[PDB]
């Protein structure tokens, strides 16, 4: 019929993006970074250990004050820790026992969870009548929620398992926009430091870059070949890394529309669970499934240090906003914090 | 430093309240079994317990039958969560071979559960449901298992096979072929760390939850004996 012609012109358009990408692929950093003095050996140590959970820890998030890290586990708890003094501040229970992510607002006022009950429960910290309970239960998805991030105290953009990232409005209680366009399940998303736009990796090896102001898709990067577990932005806004399940990380550019590097090593065989940059962005710290979270060099593409620790896989790896410490949520109810 | 002193004392008092509550509910998180209940589709999982979670208790031990009937059908991401679960109840539809041929799909789904990296240590209860629709399509033959399976014509009814009274031996041959077909996948790959406990669903639930309870007791006892290096 007439429907057959759309596929060949999609391939032709992809060929235009392909050879335009190879047009701007005239060089590589792998020759540029050779003149750069490498960081060499980097060794870090577990500073505090936060043994309060019961089941595996699925996701943590530092506050922007870099003192309080919330963490989220399958026991039904959302324990608001304290990096300086190992003191649980609130053990807020949860209805859905199967939490899959947590979130800390930049103003330190709300935290938010959300898992297999499809509902991104936003928890309130500033109830002065004693304890702390849920304010709004955002419920507009069909599939599960995999990672949610706060923009400010009024709107939260969350990923989902039913292929659609959404921008929620907390006070109203419905989706403002809907970031449709992904094909498979969508695992992680990270906001740019200017908070106007965000990337969102998924389970079709594609890291779509969106724009929350217009509410559309802008750029779709494909350099991976398995489902992308986690991504994170560069602190300047012109780059971001993608750790997928083919045991490699890849640095990209939002201004070249391509990959820039492949952080693949041969001895690692199982894929990245979480990945986040350092403060300056020189150190790309990846978190793996063979129980050790490597500390890559983000420009020389070599392991500048392998961390010790857990006896299960790591699950999340958040770096402080001032870069003072690094925490590693893992699947054995533990949170080693690393300077 | 007295402001830091009452700060430290207040924060340690909050620590004491939190740690006491965490002990008081760790004492019940260690006591409630969780049971992920998944199936293919058109199976009849609601006759077991009676948006998805449900819970019950028999003989002073608790269960949390976490159904997942609201999610998608692309299971490879949200089933990494259920490895802390004790016994993944896998109710199949044994009589969905006339139309999709859901038996081969259920076999491939079970093999994909068994060979996962994170679902290694979790055993599987197996419920060959749709027992009632099984018996008629093998005596009349509106869809043949031997059409969808080569080794059905050259299969022997097993010697240790108990019969239910008032039942044809060909129906027992069919259901025991399905049970040994699942057990072939269950014993071909790794079976030191996890097991399969096949069953046949009856019309009442008072024996069904008893079968679930005795089999979860078996999984706990094999876990403790595996910890002490006995078996």
């Amino acid at each position, epitope marked *: 019929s007439e429907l057959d012609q759309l596929r060949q012109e999609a391939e032709q358009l992809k060929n235009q993006i392909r050879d335009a990408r190879k047009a701007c692929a005239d060089a590589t950093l792998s020759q540029i970074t050779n003149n750069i003095d490498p960081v060499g050996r980097i060794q870090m140590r577990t500073r505090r250990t936060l043994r309060g959970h019961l089941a595996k820890i699925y996701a943590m998030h530092w506050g922007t004050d870099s003192r309080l890290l919330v963490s989220a586990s399958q026991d039904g708890k959302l324990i608001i820790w304290d990096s300086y003094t190992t003191n649980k501040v609130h053990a807020i229970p949860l209805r859905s026992s199967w939490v899959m992510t947590c979130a800390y607002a930049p103003s330190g006022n709300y935290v938010a969870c959300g898992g297999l009950d499809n509902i991104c429960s936003i928890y309130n910290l500033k109830t002065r009548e004693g304890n702390v309970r849920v304010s709004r239960e955002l419920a507009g998805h069909t599939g599960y929620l995999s990672c949610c991030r706060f923009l400010d105290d009024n709107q939260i953009v969350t990923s989902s398992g039913d292929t659609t990232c959404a921008l929620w409005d907390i006070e109203t209680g419905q989706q403002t926009t809907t970031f449709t366009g992904h094909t498979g399940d969508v695992m992680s998303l990270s906001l740019a430091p200017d908070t106007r736009l965000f990337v969102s990796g998924a389970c079709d090896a594609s890291a779509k870059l969106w724009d929350v102001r217009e509410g559309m898709c802008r750029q779709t990067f494909t350099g991976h070949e398995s489902d992308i577990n986690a991504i994170c932005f560069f602190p300047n806004g012109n780059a971001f890394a993608t750790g997928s399940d083919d045991a490699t990380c890849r640095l990209f550019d939002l201004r070249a529309d391509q990959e820039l590097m492949t952080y693949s090593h041969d001895n690692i065989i199982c894929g990245i669970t979480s990945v986040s940059f350092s403060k300056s962005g020189r150190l790309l710290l990846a978190g793996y499934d063979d129980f050790n979270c490597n500390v890559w060099d983000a420009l020389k593409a070599d392991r500048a240090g392998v961390l010790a620790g857990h006896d299960n896989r790591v699950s999340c790896l958040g770096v402080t906003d001032d870069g003072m410490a690094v925490a590693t949520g893992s699947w054995d109810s533990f949170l080693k914090i690393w300077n | 430093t007295e402001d830091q002193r009452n700060e430290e004392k207040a924060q340690r008092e909050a620590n004491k309240k939190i740690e006491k509550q965490l002990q008081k509910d760790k004492q019940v998180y260690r006591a409630t079994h969780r049971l992920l209940l998944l199936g293919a589709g058109e199976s009849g999982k609601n006759t077991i317990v009676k948006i998805f979670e449900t819970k019950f208790q028999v003989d002073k031990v608790n269960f949390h039958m976490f159904d997942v009937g609201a999610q998608r*059908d692309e299971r490879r991401k949200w089933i990494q969560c259920f490895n802390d679960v004790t016994a993944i109840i896998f109710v199949v539809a044994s009589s969905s071979y006339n139309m999709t041929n859901r038996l*081969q799909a259920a076999l491939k789904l079970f093999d994909s559960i068994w060979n996962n990296k994170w679902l290694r240590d979790t055993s599987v209860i197996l419920f060959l449901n749709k027992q009632d629709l099984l018996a008629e399509k093998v005596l009349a033959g509106k869809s043949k298992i031997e059409d*969808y399976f080569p080794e059905f014509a050259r299969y022997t009814t097993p010697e240790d096979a108990t019969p239910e009274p008032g039942e044809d031996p060909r129906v027992t041959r069919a259901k025991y072929f399905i049970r040994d077909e699942f057990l072939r996948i269950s014993t071909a790959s790794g079976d030191g760390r996890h097991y399969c406990y096949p069953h046949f669903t009856c019309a009442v639930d008072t024996e069904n939850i008893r079968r679930v309870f005795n089999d979860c007791r078996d999984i706990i006892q094999r876990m403790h004996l595996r910890q002490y290096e006995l078996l």
Partner: nanobody
Framework: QVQLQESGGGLVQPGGSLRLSCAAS????????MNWVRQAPGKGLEWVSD????????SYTGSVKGRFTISRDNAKNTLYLQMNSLKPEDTAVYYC?????????????????????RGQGTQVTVSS
């Protein structure tokens, strides 16, 4: 970037012999356990074949056991499913899928639409 072509195919006589060849491009083909999934027009998908990484572990659907054969070419990134002695009840479109994780023994790709790593297929039909 994954791209799965499904070369060959067409319309066969009942009893013919067709070699369906899956051309792949975008990844290390030697790592990922492939398969070959079909869907008859009118019902859902059903999984027909697989193969292991090296080529050792091979299964089939029991209705198509022995009548079809399956082989992979690691040096050419190509997957051949050669059919023999066809039947009227095997009219379907044949998607060359791929299990999604490298260096694993299990996969969840028999399921419904919007699976990622699964080519557009090749509609095959037997004669009257």
């Amino acid at each position: 970037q994954v791209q799965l072509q499904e070369s060959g195919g067409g319309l066969v006589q009942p009893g013919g012999s067709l070699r369906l060849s899956c051309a792949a491009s975008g990844f290390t083909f030697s790592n990922y356990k492939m398969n070959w999934v079909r869907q008859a027009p009118g019902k859902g998908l059903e999984w027909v074949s697989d193969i292991s990484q090296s080529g050792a572990s091979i299964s089939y659907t029991g209705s198509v056991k022995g009548r079809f054969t399956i082989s992979r070419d690691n040096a050419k990134n190509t997957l051949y499913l050669q059919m023999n002695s066809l039947k009227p009840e095997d009219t379907a479109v044949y998607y060359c899928a791929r299990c999604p994780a490298p260096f694993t023994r299990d996969c969840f790709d028999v399921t419904s639409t919007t699976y990622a790593y699964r080519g557009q297929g090749t509609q095959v039909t037997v004669s009257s």
